[PDB]
A paper describes a structure:
α-Synuclein forms amyloid fibrils that are critical in the progression of Parkinson’s disease and serves as the pathological hallmark of this condition. Different posttranslational modifications have been identified at multiple sites of α-synuclein, influencing its conformation, aggregation and function. In this study, we focus on α-syn S87, which can be modified by both phosphorylation and O-GlcNAcylation. Remarkably, we revealed by using cryo-EM that pS87 α-syn and gS87 α-syn form amyloid fibrils with distinct structures.
For pS87 sample, 2D classification identified two different fibril morphologies, including the straight filament polymorph (~74%) and the twisted filament polymorph (~26%). Besides, we managed to obtain the high-quality density map of the twisted filament with an overall resolution of 2.6 Å. The pS87 twisted filament features a half pitch of ~154 nm, a helical rise of 2.41 Å, and a helical twist of −179.72°. In the pS87 α-syn fibril, α-syn adopts an arch-like fold in the fibril core, composed of residues M1 to T72 folding into 7 β-strands (β1-β7). Unlike the gS87 and unmodified WT α-syn fibrils formed under identical condition, the entire N-terminal region participates in fibril core formation in the pS87 fibril. While, the phosphorylated S87 is excluded from the fibril core, and remains flexible and invisible from cryo-EM. Starting from residue 73, the extended C-terminal region (residues 73-140) remains highly flexible in the fibril structure, without electron density. In the pS87 fibril structure, residues 1-29 from the N-terminal form a U-shaped structure stabilized by two pairs of salt bridges, including K6 & E20 and K21 & D2. Meanwhile, V3 and M5 on β1 establish hydrophobic interactions with residues L38’ and V40’ from the neighboring chain, forming intermolecular interactions that bring the two protofilaments together. The second U-shaped structure is formed by residues 30-49, stabilized by a salt bridge between K32 and E46 and a hydrogen bond between K34 and Y39. β2 (residues 26-29) forms a steric zipper-like hydrophobic interaction with residues 52-55, connecting the two U-shaped structures.
Numbering used by the authors:
A (entry chain C), B (entry chain A), C (entry chain B), D (entry chain F), E (entry chain D), F (entry chain E): 1 to 72
């Protein structure tokens, strides 16, 4: 539940770039997150949690652009 | 539950860049986070949590841009 | 639950850069965080937590930009 | 956005009564309430607010029952 | 945004009564309340707020019951 | 945003009563309350606030019960 607002992003002879909560080359395994969570008289059971992640880029001469400007 | 607001991002003969809570080349394993969490008369059980992560970039001549401007 | 506000980010013949709580080349394993967490008459049990993380960049001639400007 | 849950309300030779957030003989005028309200880059204007309320019961021998049991 | 939970309200040869956040004979005028309210880059204007309330019960021999048991 | 939890309210040859944040015979005028309120880069203007409240019960032989048991 994220809110993103941008009023009047004006650019003239320039660059108005903006990159929010971006993931790039990220490996996550068996993680638990909780935001704005309410438990009232509740029960929760959970067994073994097994997770494995991997991010392997073998790269050369890459131009990656998640938002913004790249002039090469 | 994050809120991102930007009013009048104006640029002229320049650069207005902005990068928020970005992850890049990040490895997370078996982590637990809690933000704004309320437990009321609740029970929670959890078994073994096994996690493994890996981020390996073998790279040369990379131009990565998550927001902003890159002029090369 | 983070709040990001920026009013009138104006740039002229210059650079207005901003990078918030960014992670880059970060390895986390079996960590527990708690922000604004309330326990009321609650029980919580947890088993063995096993985690392993790794971030290995073997790199040369990289131009990484998470927000801001990079002119090379 | 209220939640009301009742599990196994059992009664035997007795009374299981329950009255939640009830109003009775209540007068409200020109009040403003806000619960879980989020304003993001918003404008709000409001003129004169004129309100008048009145609750007048001229009564005798009344048996009022909002939930529960009344044995007279 | 209130939560009401009741597990196993059992009664035998007795009374299990419960009255939550009840108003009775209450007069409110020109009051402002705020619970869990977030303002982000917002403007709010408000004019004169005029309010008047009144609760007048001229009563005799009344049996009022908002939840619970009344045996008379 | 109030939370009300009750587990196993059992009664036998007795009384299990419970009254939470109840108002009765309460007069409020031009009051301002704030709970868990966050202002970020926000403006708020407010004019004259005029309020008047009144609670007048002229009563005899009243049996009022907001939760609990009344045996008369």
């Amino acid at each position: 539940m994220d809110v993103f607002m941008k009023g009047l992003s004006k650019a003239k002879e320039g660059v108005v770039a903006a990159a929010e909560k971006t993931k790039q080359g990220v490996a996550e395994a068996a993680g638990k997150t909780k935001e704005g969570v309410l438990y009232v008289g509740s029960k929760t059971k959970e067994g073994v949690v097994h997770g494995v992640a991997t991010v392997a880029e073998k790269t050369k001469e890459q131009v990656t652009n998640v938002g913004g400007a790249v002039v090469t």
